[PDB]
Nucleic acid binder design. Sequence first.
RNA 1: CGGACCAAGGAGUCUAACGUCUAUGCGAGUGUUUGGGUGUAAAACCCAUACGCGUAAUGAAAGUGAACGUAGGUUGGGGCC
RNA 2: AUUGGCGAGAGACCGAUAGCGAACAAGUACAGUGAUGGAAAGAUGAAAAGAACUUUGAAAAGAGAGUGAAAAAGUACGUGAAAUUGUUGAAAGGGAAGGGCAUUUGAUCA
Lengths: 127, 58, 52, 52, 185, 125, 148, 49
Amino acid sequence: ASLPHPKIVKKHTKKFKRHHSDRYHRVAENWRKQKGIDSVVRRRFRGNISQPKIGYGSNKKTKFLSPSGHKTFLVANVKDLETLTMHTKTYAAEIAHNISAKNRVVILARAKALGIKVTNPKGRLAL
Amino acid sequence: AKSKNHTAHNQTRKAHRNGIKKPKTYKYPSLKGVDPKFRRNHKHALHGTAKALAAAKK
Amino acid sequence: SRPQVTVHSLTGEATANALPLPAVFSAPIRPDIVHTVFTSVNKNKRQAYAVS
Amino acid sequence: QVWGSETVASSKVGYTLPSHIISTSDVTRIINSSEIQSAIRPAGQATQKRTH
Amino acid sequence: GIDHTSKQHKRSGHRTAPKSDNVYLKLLVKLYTFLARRTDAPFNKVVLKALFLSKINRPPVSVSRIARALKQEGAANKTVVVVGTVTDDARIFEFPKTTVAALRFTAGARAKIVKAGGECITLDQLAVRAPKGQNTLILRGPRNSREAVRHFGMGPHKGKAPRILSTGRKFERARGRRRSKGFKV
Amino acid sequence: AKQSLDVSSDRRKARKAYFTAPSSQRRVLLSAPLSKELRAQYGIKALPIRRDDEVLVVRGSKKGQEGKISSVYRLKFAVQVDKVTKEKVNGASVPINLHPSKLVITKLHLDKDRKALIQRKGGKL
Amino acid sequence: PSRFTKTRKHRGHVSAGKGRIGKHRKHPGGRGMAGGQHHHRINMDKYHPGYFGKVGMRYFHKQQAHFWKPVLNLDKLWTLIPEDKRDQYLKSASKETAPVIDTLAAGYGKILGKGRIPNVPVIVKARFVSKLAEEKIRAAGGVVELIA
Amino acid sequence: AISKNLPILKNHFRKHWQERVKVHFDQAGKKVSRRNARATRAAKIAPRP
RNA sequence: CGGACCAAGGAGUCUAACGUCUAUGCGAGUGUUUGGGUGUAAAACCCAUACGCGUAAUGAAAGUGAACGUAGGUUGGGGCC
RNA sequence: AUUGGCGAGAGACCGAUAGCGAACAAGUACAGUGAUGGAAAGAUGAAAAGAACUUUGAAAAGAGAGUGAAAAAGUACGUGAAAUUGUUGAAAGGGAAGGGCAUUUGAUCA
């Protein structure tokens, strides 16, 4: 039920990773800019890893847009689900990981009755 | 431990980075350095001119 | 004039008595000053701590 | 009497209620006033139509 | 590549939108922005620009200043418009009746105006009375009257009030100010 | 809250006092409520536990079981009640310790000191 | 405070806002006001003239109570009287009845001539009076009395 | 040391002022103690002022 | 040149007196919290005199101490008529 | 006035590599003839209910059985990562591995 929107395009789908993160275990995969004077990445030599810049910004119209075309909204209870009544065509319901299955099934039933898309319907459900 | 003594390189570029402004010209420049007798003449002349202007129309 | 606010009895039902407003509610509302003064005063009730 | 009024004393040393820097809290009514509307020029078309 | 002849992405240098979080002043700024946008009168633009000045940029103005402004012929019917705080001045004894519009009024100045018979209004009342600023006069206080200004641009052979907490004998009056003690400035 | 300037509301101080309370303090700390019938009979809400006091379990997995008290372990802050225990795999019987506050005093051993305490606390017997 | 400090933004940067060629060595040149005449002489002679040398004679046991000379002008002369009576005194410019001002009682010792008071008689009591102020007060109609 | 256009400051802190420095965190407590002492003195010295 | 690896800890913080800028409050005045009363009790509220800075500066000092006027004339000058 | 002693009330303080050197048999073990220096060490489980009994093994122990809400809680005991190692599964390997640009193939995915 997503509104007609421009095709989702991503300039850089690959996740940016820190230099030598695979080489050394103490270096986490979280990106950190290299400030060394003789840093190859900072000097931007040919054949290096990509550096995050202002050019990689996604389209504003498609910003925070899921592939299904519905924005993700975190839901905590029935009252929180009520927030997505008159905006269901442009939003999606997501259930927090702190929610027990007993209340999860009630929230799922409420969303089904109210016509609200659920990001993770099969969460903490018996299978 | 020899070092460079004097070098004029990049000085002209540093000076030209900001526009070399001409000194500001005013309608009435400072009367310093002029003859003191001429200054007294100036003071008396404007005193008389102001008195005449006030007499004609205040 | 200024609005007359009805006074409710202890039983929970408003009576016929009416009173003028206390001439403060017309003061300007300044959230910035309110927040600044509240933050400043909230530090007054504090206990000093220091490592030996 | 405790906090003062427009006629009674404020019961405080040289204290007066703060003055309002703007007469009314609503500016839409000021905009809609006839004197302002007569002086203001006719409006446009909100979002300008794209040309060329 | 473009051979830039000037700094790119250079800020205009003029403060847009007030820095203060005053909600009432923000509403006044919005009202005057709308007035300047919809009217060609430069008075609205001048008032909007003056509303953006800082505390040190909006010096205070004593009642004697508006008294002198009214003393000029043709300004008796003019309604003064000062962007700042009007302060009481005890030097002036007789205050002619007039209309004064300012953001803030001192208690003494307001009492003096009321006693003299003049009227005091706020900026929005002034705007609704005269949307185009008809028969209005703009008053500004002395900008360089601040005590910090006298210390500005201190240098040799300038005499620009050198910064010192305690003045008097032996405090910044030794060699450097007297010809007998070495030299003078 | 607290209006007195001498009592302590600190959790650390309260826990320290409870854990290091001597035998005399533990005697009054280990108190059990009385039954409804016994409360109607004496007019006393609660009394300190005793070795020869009949008690009935009101909370826990042993609900409904009643018996006499074999011994009160003030060191362990508990009281042992006979005729209710768990059987070990070795074949021996080990008593199960339980808090006195989880019991309802069905009957108590009346003595001279006990009767004096009843009169001091305002009993009718 | 801590959140708004530039140190948090400097986090990550190697030099932390202190440069690379010249490190932030504690007390690089001198300490306090060291070298006021050797290597800081340029700043001493350009920004703080008159720092070095003697000025005049020495006055031992300088008691500031002796040099208690508060001043006021004719413009503020009328401000001492409360307005409730000041307005009617201004309205009634009468010689036989004039307001009396005690500058000493308000903490002002010397009378200075500035303000051009209106032509209303007024009696003023002060320890010291200036020539111009006395002439102006005499011309206004009132007289000045010296009390101590 | 010497810096830009800043007034000369004469701060006497060369000595070990950290060892000998007093801070009054006890203002309210000592005020309450003084009030209690005044009340008990009024009680002790009889209706005498 | 330091670096075998990993985990934990790790470095422009605070005080006294200030310079520029900004915000708030009052305004030729300004600062309750030295202290007293009051208090639901280190919280909050109220208050008299004093004192810090400014309103007058220049001299080593004895001392003196700012309208000939529409608080002056002229140039440039936003706004207003 | 009070970094000593005793009896008390609190913290926008700290949390077992923090906080006093010491939360535990801490000025203890220990080192130096000597004056002195000076640590590491908190947590099973509500309740030991601490694994009866059978089998293999000399025994330490292993496997069944049982207590236990949980033995993925066994007096090496709350929760249980990396550096390092073993088993199973997948992939690559003519004097390095690791990375970036794009794609084929395999696995996997809304």
